[PDB]
Amino acid sequence: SHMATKAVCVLKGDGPVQGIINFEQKESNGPVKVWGSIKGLTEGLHGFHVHEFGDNTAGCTSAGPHFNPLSRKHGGPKDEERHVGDLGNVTADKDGVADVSIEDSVISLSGDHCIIGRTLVVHEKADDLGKGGNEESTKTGNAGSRLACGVIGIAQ
Amino acid sequence: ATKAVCVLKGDGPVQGIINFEQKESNGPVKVWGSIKGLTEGLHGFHVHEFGDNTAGCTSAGPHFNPLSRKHGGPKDEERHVGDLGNVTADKDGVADVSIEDSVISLSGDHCIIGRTLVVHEKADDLGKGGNEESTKTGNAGSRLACGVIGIAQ
Ligand SMILES: [Cu+2]
Ligand SMILES: [Cu+2]
Ligand SMILES: [Zn+2]
Ligand SMILES: [Zn+2]
Ligand SMILES: [Zn+2]
């Protein structure tokens, strides 16, 4: 019992980047709907992953690597070979506002792929989805630094 | 040996780091850390229902209360699962936190991972206040700092 069906995350950092991202999974093994808004972003694509640790002690850098329980290489959300936390990119319009609505079946709000208590992150550059051609791309997608993060938590 | 952490922030000077350790399932949890910016005295201290900060510490909801009981002190039988009692801040305004509770847990059905830790303005009267507020919040007043309890290395 008490397996979460709804979660929320408030993204914040040392810059103007901040938003609210909601999660929702009405079925235990079903997909998770991620939707919300993030502002303060440069127009274009930005990486969007669930990192391993809900540790904000040192900002977003304490959150650790991409949540990778299956010890896979980095990739796009649609790729088979991916990190559990690899949700791809979010797109910011010309006014810095990135409406977010993605749906993912790898992450879960309950079970072994459970993301509750971990850190959602949005990055400076685009997630090259592991196609970058260097070992860094296999690790992070060359998404750059962490502009904002927050701990994923149970929502009423 | 589960481990978690919580960075407490607010609209004021209160801020701290609070570590959790549950070395065994359904066993006791050690809560230790430091909170600066407090006013000399005791401050209410509990886990709330929701790890929801979309409206500051307000949106964290009431004390984690899966059993639907009345508020109490952590040694009481009639208590909210989240009811961790008080912490004490010196004349310095620094509170050194060290607690051990066997009701909260870092796993299980009623795990506090993903919920919110809140440090309150006033002392928690442990439900002995003689008013309906005492049996809900212990009259610990407004919420000064809070963070989502998250999974730590
Ligand atoms: Cu990331
Ligand atoms: Cu409280
Ligand atoms: Zn990845
Ligand atoms: Zn229950
Ligand atoms: Zn209580």
Side-chain angles (χ1 to χ4, degrees):
Chain A
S1 268
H2 276 267
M3 58 189 71
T5 291
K6 304 171 53 179
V8 65
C9 181
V10 175
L11 294 150
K12 279 213 188 180
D14 308 337
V17 185
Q18 69 194 236
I20 300 165
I21 294 306
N22 315 90
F23 305 76
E24 162 152 319
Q25 189 186 36
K26 288 172 305 180
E27 290 180 345
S28 297
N29 54 5
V32 178
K33 299 195 160 305
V34 188
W35 73 110
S37 175
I38 308 173
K39 62 170 171 299
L41 277 165
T42 46
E43 192 180 355
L45 257 35
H46 289 260
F48 198 53
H49 332 92
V50 175
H51 288 254
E52 194 180 344
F53 299 122
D55 186 336
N56 186 225
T57 267
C60 298
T61 144
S62 304
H66 296 164
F67 180 42
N68 189 25
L70 303 180
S71 295
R72 303 291 168 76
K73 295 180 176 178
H74 180 74
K78 301 198 300 169
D79 293 308
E80 171 74 328
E81 176 72 26
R82 52 173 276 194
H83 303 149
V84 141
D86 286 322
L87 301 184
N89 285 292
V90 309
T91 310
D93 66 13
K94 41 196 60 178
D95 13 318
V97 168
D99 173 64
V100 185
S101 178
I102 109 189
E103 163 168 316
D104 194 287
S105 52
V106 191
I107 68 176
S108 192
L109 301 194
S110 55
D112 36 331
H113 295 163
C114 193
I115 65 163
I116 295 291
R118 309 192 193 263
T119 299
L120 177 58
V121 174
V122 53
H123 292 261
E124 182 191 7
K125 325 178 221 161
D127 188 337
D128 74 9
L129 317 171
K131 312 203 208 314
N134 46 27
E135 189 164 335
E136 185 61 31
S137 179
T138 79
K139 293 152 75 65
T140 70
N142 289 281
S145 63
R146 306 171 179 183
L147 295 201
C149 56
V151 184
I152 298 172
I154 303 176
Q156 173 173 209
Chain B
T2 315
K3 194 117 46 62
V5 69
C6 182
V7 181
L8 300 169
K9 287 191 188 288
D11 305 313
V14 186
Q15 37 171 348
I17 303 334
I18 285 304
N19 307 281
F20 305 75
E21 249 199 349
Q22 188 179 13
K23 284 150 47 180
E24 225 199 13
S25 55
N26 92 272
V29 179
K30 189 179 192 291
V31 185
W32 67 277
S34 168
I35 313 182
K36 67 187 73 197
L38 275 320
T39 182
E40 182 178 32
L42 353 191
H43 287 83
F45 193 77
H46 346 57
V47 181
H48 286 252
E49 288 286 0
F50 314 115
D52 181 354
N53 198 45
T54 53
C57 303
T58 303
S59 40
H63 304 164
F64 183 26
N65 189 27
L67 290 215
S68 178
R69 287 175 167 180
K70 301 222 191 77
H71 179 69
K75 320 245 273 292
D76 278 319
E77 168 71 32
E78 182 63 32
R79 62 174 264 191
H80 303 138
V81 164
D83 274 337
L84 289 181
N86 285 288
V87 297
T88 309
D90 316 305
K91 214 173 222 67
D92 30 51
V94 181
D96 271 298
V97 201
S98 188
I99 289 174
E100 193 174 20
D101 211 46
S102 300
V103 182
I104 61 164
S105 183
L106 299 190
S107 63
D109 290 321
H110 290 169
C111 62
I112 59 170
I113 263 37
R115 310 177 183 276
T116 296
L117 185 68
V118 182
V119 63
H120 295 245
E121 164 204 355
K122 301 180 194 184
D124 179 347
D125 71 2
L126 312 163
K128 313 182 195 290
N131 61 17
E132 194 182 316
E133 200 57 40
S134 184
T135 70
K136 296 192 177 59
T137 71
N139 294 306
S142 74
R143 317 181 175 191
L144 302 193
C146 63
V148 181
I149 300 167
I151 305 178
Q153 191 169 33

